[PDB]
Design a protein around this ligand. Structure first.
Ligand SMILES: [Ca+2]
Ligand code: NA
Length: 934
């Protein structure tokens, strides 16, 4: 018959209450800017097209003509306009994400749908403008393209623009000027722009906690960092519509599942516990059953693959966290795989009857998380220190429209944003009747303030404190409270419903202006929470710590007026213990919460954030790896048995290892140097078995090579960085590699001669983004800055004199007024070629080679060796002999191949190779030394 909608069962943000007041979007236009869409999805329909702004393609083309828009097309009655702003892209168009976002905003699935419940988004009777943008030619081009989409959406009549995309940590200041002006244009026209906060958690990413020493751990980027947009974080309500399983316990019992691929509904499956699935013995009894597997130790896909190997028909993976979130499991060759909570997995593990049934229709059940901010949701602050996100909305396991007329659950701030966008659109409609004498810009400003003020500050029940405003903004959107609101709260300058205090001492004041738009005076009680970061050892826990709550005050605000209040804060008695945990300073933040009576529910809340310290001047760069006491850094674990081991790149394709602050250089072995100087064109895997390797400056192999490099240091503890700028590719240069804890600007390298002169300056790297993860899917843990490469030459192109120089790297934080920072390395330049024996004698009896003289080098000797190069399956293969203690070398008679065959060695196979610590090198055939007699 007529199917219920999802919202009929499950409306965590109370959208129905606002729809009762303001409608469902008929006659309104909204826009979605995303990566691609299924433009034909069944969810794209209007109940009554006669009420639409655009009743035909001709209506659309008329509006296109009035604004000089000569591109884009009408699609159907719902999708009034589509344009692809990134058609020069070579990659295939991804349709899932944009369709899913658009469905939350404006899906209107028919009752003929195959799904059990109709997807009905927040503004299901609005028309859509669908604008595709994707990164093709860099981020500035990308922002110019979505700036045009914004401008076109405004001029085609969109009242709301949803942008569920972003690039982490980027500064607003670095956006193209035309992108900044597009945001301002939307604001000036009363068009709301809603942005997703991002799914990057904090510095370090969703698998890591940031270090307590480094409080500027925000990763919100652009477009979200634009102040005029409304930026949306993700949380889980304490209940959610979910697919379920049924089990008989020690009575029936229903449990939430999140399934990848499809179990057979209404089928009783047997299941068997397989521990964490880390060995084959784990799966000894899963054949023909579902494998119950605890999260941990290994990847999900590995657990699932091994269960499939053992004959399992499906997989249940249960969390190793208490109060966790469902995680969408990977699709491994269509294997049914469902994620369940720890409590439910432990229940099944010890359950007598190991049988389980999957239900075909979903139902609302409590979440394992309770009311809790999503672990993936991006934290503020922005790069220049502004407060983002602004607000939170449900973004866990949201069911919406995807490609090919299908539906699926996705999690992300991308899902939270379009729900807020639809609430914004409907509240703007309400205000067209409620405040008709306001301009569109005034109504938009009011709507943003009311949404943020009326948003409910979410409370962390585990920590007994409100989640940080740098995680939840002004709280969880509530369309019922928003629609009912006749008041709102702002900072003292009336610019936004949040208070940014910048740097504070232990005593400060939180000032709020309380705005009353009703015709009657109103009395409110208000109380400030005072809170900071919880710390576990050396890490932020990414959880709140309450310090205290101020005493309740009250105020009466006259009708159609505003009144300022001030809450004094004094955290002085906490400072000793807080500095012990957060030695470079810490946030002092919280919410001013307003009620009609202290015993009633929260009516409004406004977040405030200050930083007890000097935020702008926090170190932007992680200290060089060389200075680490234990050899570890944020993204690099030391070898516990050899803290000075520090290997180079090897033959790795991706640079996932050894991400830290350091200088790079290159090791070029003598066989490659020789081949290049002889003009050999095809070297690798052909002329030599040795490799050119990018390594860390100041590292050196042992003479008997164990395949590792080790830091060497001057007696003063600085790394022994040294270069030989003679153009052979062996240690010719140094180049800065940085793990940036904070964004920075105007990064430049220069060389001081330690006599008072700058002798060389690099080109400037204008924009530096913090290394907020160490993952190919986002960013690596360190960045190599090619512009800083120093070839040992001065500003006139002349190699500097042999000596020690300061290689200085300068960079400035983004924060207003921050001082320039710098990090210095001593670098030795020495181009003296080793002076070595030109003759030798050879004793056949004991096979000892005696050199006529010993090496004389400017820098200390690095290696003095005899190489032998022998054929191994058509490849000249080089191994090395170290000197005897009497200075001779014992030459072997044969070598052994990898496959085990004996290869006789000839005198012509041996080469004498001497190298110093700057990379200066000589290589002489042993046969030439033996001929060095008259
Ligand atoms: Ca060199
Ligand atoms: Na609020």
């Amino acid at each position: 018959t007529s199917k219920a909608t999802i919202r009929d069962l499950n409306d965590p943000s109370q959208v129905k209450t606002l729809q009762e007041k303001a409608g469902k979007g008929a006659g309104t236009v909204v826009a979605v800017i995303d990566a691609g869409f299924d433009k034909n999805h069944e969810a794209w329909r209007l109940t009554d097209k006669t009420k639409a702004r655009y009743q035909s393609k001709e209506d659309l083309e008329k509006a296109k003509k009035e604004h000089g828009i000569t591109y884009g097309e009408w699609v159907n009655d719902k999708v009034a306009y589509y344009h692809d702003y990134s058609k020069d892209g070579k990659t295939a168009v991804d349709q899932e994400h944009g369709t899913h976002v658009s469905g939350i905003l404006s899906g209107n699935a028919p009752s003929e749908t195959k799904e059990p419940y109709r997807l009905e988004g927040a503004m299901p009777e609005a028309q859509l403008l669908l604008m595709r943008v994707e990164i093709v030619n860099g981020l500035a081009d990308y922002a110019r393209n979505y700036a045009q989409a914004i401008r076109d959406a405004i001029n085609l009549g969109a009242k709301v623009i949803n942008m569920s995309f972003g690039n982490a940590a980027l500064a607003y200041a670095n956006l193209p000027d035309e992108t900044k002006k597009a945001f301002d244009y939307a604001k000036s026209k009363g068009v709301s722009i809603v942005t997703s906060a991002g799914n990057d958690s904090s510095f370090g990413g969703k698998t890591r906690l940031p270090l307590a020493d480094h409080p500027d751990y925000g990763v919100v980027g652009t477009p979200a960092a634009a102040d005029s947009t409304l930026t949306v974080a993700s949380y889980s309500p304490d209940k959610q519509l979910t697919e379920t399983v049924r089990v008989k316990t020690a009575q029936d019992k229903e449990m939430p599942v999140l399934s990848t691929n499809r179990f057979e509904p209404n089928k009783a499956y047997d299941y068997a516990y397989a521990n964490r699935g880390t060995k084959e013995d784990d799966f000894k009894d899963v054949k023909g059953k579902i494998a119950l597997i605890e999260r941990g130790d290994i990847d999900f896909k590995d657990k699932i693959a091994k269960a499939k190997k053992a004959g399992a028909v499906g997989v249940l993976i249960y969390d190793n966290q208490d109060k966790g979130f469902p995680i969408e499991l990977p699709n491994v060759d269509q294997m049914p795989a469902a994620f369940i909570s720890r409590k439910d997995g432990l229940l099944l593990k010890d359950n007598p009857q190991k049988t389980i049934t999957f239900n075909a229709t979903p139902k609302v059940l409590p979440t394992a998380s309770g009311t809790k901010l999503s672990r993936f949701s991006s934290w503020g602050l922005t790069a220049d220190g502004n407060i983002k996100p602004d607000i939170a909305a449900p973004g866990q396991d949201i069911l919406s429209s995807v490609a090919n007329n299908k539906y699926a659950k996705l999690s992300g701030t991308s899902m939270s944003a379009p729900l807020v966008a639809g609430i914004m659109g409907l509240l703007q409609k309400q205000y067209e009747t409620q405040y008709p004498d306001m301009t569109p810009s005034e109504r938009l400003d009011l709507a943003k303030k009311v949404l943020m003020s009326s948003a409910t500050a979410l409370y962390d029940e585990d920590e007994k404190a409100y989640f940080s405003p740098r995680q939840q903004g002004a709280g969880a959107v509530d369309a019922k409270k928003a629609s009912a609101a006749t008041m709102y709260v702002t900072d003292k300058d009336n610019t936004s419903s949040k208070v940014h205090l910048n740097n504070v001492s232990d005593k400060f004041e939180v000032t709020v202006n309380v705005h009353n738009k009703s015709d009657k005076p109103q009395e409110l009680y208000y109380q400030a929470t005072v809170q900071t970061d919880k710390v576990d050892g050396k890490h932020f826990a990414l959880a709140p710590k309450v310090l205290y709550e101020a005493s309740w005050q009250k105020i009466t605000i006259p009708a159609n007026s505003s009144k300022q209040v001030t809450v004094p804060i004094d955290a002085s008695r906490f400072s000793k213990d807080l500095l012990a945990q957060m030695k470079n300073g810490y946030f002092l933040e919280g919410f001013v919460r307003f009620k009609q009576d202290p015993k009633k529910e929260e009516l409004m809340s406004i977040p405030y954030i200050g930083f007890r310290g000097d935020f702008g001047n926090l170190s932007a760069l992680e200290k060089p790896i060389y200075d680490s006491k234990d050899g570890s850094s944020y993204y690099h674990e030391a070898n516990s048995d050899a803290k000075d081991q520090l290997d180079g790149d090897g033959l790795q394709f991706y640079a996932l290892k050894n991400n830290f602050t350091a200088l790079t250089t290159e090791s070029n072995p003598w066989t490659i140097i020789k081949a290049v100087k002889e003009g050999v064109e095809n070297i690798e895997d052909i002329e030599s078995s040795e490799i050119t390797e990018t390594i860390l400056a100041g590292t050196f192999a042992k003479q008997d090579d164990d395949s590792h490099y080790y830091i060497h240091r001057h007696a003063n503890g600085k790394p022994y960085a040294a270069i030989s700028p003679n153009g052979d590719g062996n240690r010719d240069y140094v180049q800065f590699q940085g793990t940036f804890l904070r964004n920075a600007k105007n990064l430049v390298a220069e060389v001081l001669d330690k006599e008072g002169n700058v002798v060389w300056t690099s080109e400037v790297t204008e924009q530096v983004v913090k290394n907020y993860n160490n993952d190919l899917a986002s960013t690596l843990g360190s960045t190599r800055f090619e512009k800083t490469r120093w070839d040992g030459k001065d500003k006139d192109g002349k190699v500097v004199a042999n000596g020690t120089y300061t290689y200085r790297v300068r960079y400035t934080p983004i924060s207003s007024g921050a001082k320039e920072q710098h990090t210095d390395f001593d670098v030795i330049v020495d181009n003296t070629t080793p002076e070595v024996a030109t003759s030798a004698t050879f004793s056949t009896e004991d096979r000892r080679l005696t050199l006529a003289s010993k090496p004389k080098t400017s820098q200390p000797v690095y290696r003095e060796r005899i190489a032998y190069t022998y054929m191994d399956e058509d490849l000249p293969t080089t191994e090395y002999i170290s000197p005897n203690e009497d200075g001779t070398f014992t030459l072997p008679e044969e070598a052994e191949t990898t496959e085990g065959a004996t290869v006789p060695l000839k005198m012509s196979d041996f080469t004498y190779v001497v190298e110093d610590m700057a990379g200066n090198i000589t290589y002489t055939p042993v046969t030439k030394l033996l001929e060095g007699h008259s």
